[PDB]
Swiss-Prot record, chains A, B:
Functional summary from the UniProt entry: GTPase involved in protein precursor import into chloroplasts. Seems to recognize chloroplast-destined precursor proteins and regulate their presentation to the translocation channel through GTP hydrolysis.
GO terms under cellular component: chloroplast outer membrane
Protein name from the UniProt record: Translocase of chloroplast 34
Main location: plastid
Region of interest (G3), residue spans: 86-89
Protein's cellular compartments: Plastid, Chloroplast outer membrane
Gene (name only): TOC34
Interval of the full protein contained in this chain: 8 to 258 of 310
Positions on the Cytoplasmic side per record topology: 1-251
Organism encoding this protein: Pisum sativum (Garden pea)
Length: 257, 257
């Protein structure tokens, strides 16, 4: 119900793009949208939430571990309401943190997931079963259908690849390596439209470079914030159904042994 | 037996410091030194090896996983011989890679570990049992005594801490968080001299800033290369014994159930 005043922190050019995207939503009778942010710990999930809202609404720690309770931030602008749910990492010690996973499930009880934002770091060089277990955990808790509404977001995008490797090439290799394990973890068929998960780049840093319109751009010259909301809008408006979470859904999914 | 020509890649000021340290070693009748580089995958172990040797002697991949075979690089200068053993990460999928761990053990068979270089990234924000299992694995394979010869090295030191947090403060928090799990994994007593593990900073990047002497310095104004070799020299010259690895050692350690 609180005004999305945080938009006033974005460069004017970006604000106009975002307001236009919210317009397209209300145009399609989409008056609100719930985005669920999930992934491992320390990848910049809550920092992404602050960047999107435009204010320090959630806690971020470069040392201490995340809190256990999920948090939903809600703001409104021009009749549209954005709801974003920040959550604690799902992995710890090498296994799926069942306490964090279930507390998230309880929090989503009676809520509708319109967009799944899977977060990880761009500047990472390895991928293993740990990433696969996160994707699997998500599927087991909400159904493979959630992937039709998924977007993978890579943080720390203001990166300079080592060995003078082209930014575009590093991004390509990194994305492919991560989509592979995610697709495997979620048991998604390579041909299914659901495996076709979009990847976006994110730089939450305040030192992020900017274009002549004062917009935060990436090394590839793209204003990541407008692009992010654009992707979110397109995924939300796709023909797939949002995921309504209720006990029935949770039970029917737990039934699968 | 090959000349350490790679020293010619270091700034003159650094070369003189390093040559002086090698002199102190031969002064103490220490004609050779074997450094064992270990840690998780993708933290910059082999990149550290190239920086120390001063040439692309080992493989580095920002995507593909490390090779399975350990590699020892040997170079000589002024009668001193440096032997450095690069190894594959010990963790994978959340568990200790028993194949990589044992292949390393076979490689060290009949070798003497003078310095243990435990490698990890500076720019990481979480620490869990995974880091503890690596430290434990090391202890279980060679004995808690190896820690008397250990040094923890944090890569990506050319880092700008988020939230405008002081570099020195980030380094402090990060080191303490990592030493904690390592000390726990190795079952080291907080008062024992063995728990007093030194931490050094490393920036393998070619974009690393430099001082007026052309030396690669860190955000704290320290030439990390000379400092690194200095620490290695001091640890090697401490009163503790190096670890001679033989079947007997391996067996006696495996005996402990
Ligand atoms: N440079 C950079 N730092 C970031 C980025 N995202 C997150 N951070 C830092 O990464 C740390 C962890 O962020 P946080 O949002 O708490 O991660 P989480 O635990 O997954 O929610 C914090 O110190 C953030 O300042 C990013 O995109 N770039
Ligand atoms: N900026 C930066 N990149 C580094 C640093 N050390 C390693 N790298 C990069 O990190 C990746 C992994 O390095 P590598 O030595 O192969 O790690 P390992 O698998 O643990 O041996 C490579 O792309 C290196 O270029 C470092 O200190 N700073
Ligand atoms: Mg968080
Ligand atoms: Mg390596």
């Amino acid at each position: 119900v609180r005004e999305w005043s945080g938009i006033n922190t974005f460069a004017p050019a970006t604000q106009t793009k975002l307001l236009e995207l919210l317009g397209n939503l209300k145009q399609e009778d989409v008056n609100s949208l719930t985005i669920l942010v999930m992934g491992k710990g320390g990848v910049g999930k809550s920092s992404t939430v602050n960047s999107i809202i435009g204010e320090r609404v959630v806690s971020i720690s470069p040392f201490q571990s995340e809190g256990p309770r999920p948090v939903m931030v809600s703001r409104s602008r021009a009749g549209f309401t954005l709801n974003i749910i920040d959550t604690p990492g799902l992995i710890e010690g090498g296994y799926i943190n069942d306490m964090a996973l279930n507390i998230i499930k309880s929090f989503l009880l009676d809520k509708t997931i319109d967009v799944l934002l899977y977060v990880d770091r761009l500047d990472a060089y390895r991928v293993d079963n740990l990433d696969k277990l996160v994707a699997k955990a998500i599927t087991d808790s909400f159904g493979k259908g959630i992937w039709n509404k998924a977007i993978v977001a890579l943080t720390h995008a203001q990166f300079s690849p080592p060995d003078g490797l082209p930014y575009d090439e590093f991004f390509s290799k990194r994305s492919e390596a991560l989509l592979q394990v995610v697709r495997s973890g979620a048991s998604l068929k390579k041909d299914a439209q659901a495996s076709d998960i979009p990847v976006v780049l994110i730089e939450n840093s305040g030192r992020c470079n900017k274009n002549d319109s004062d917009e935060k751009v990436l090394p590839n010259g793209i204003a990541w914030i407008p692009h992010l909301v654009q992707t979110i809008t397109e995924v939300a408006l796709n023909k797939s159904e949002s995921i309504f979470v209720d006990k029935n859904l949770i039970d029917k999914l737990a039934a699968a042994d």
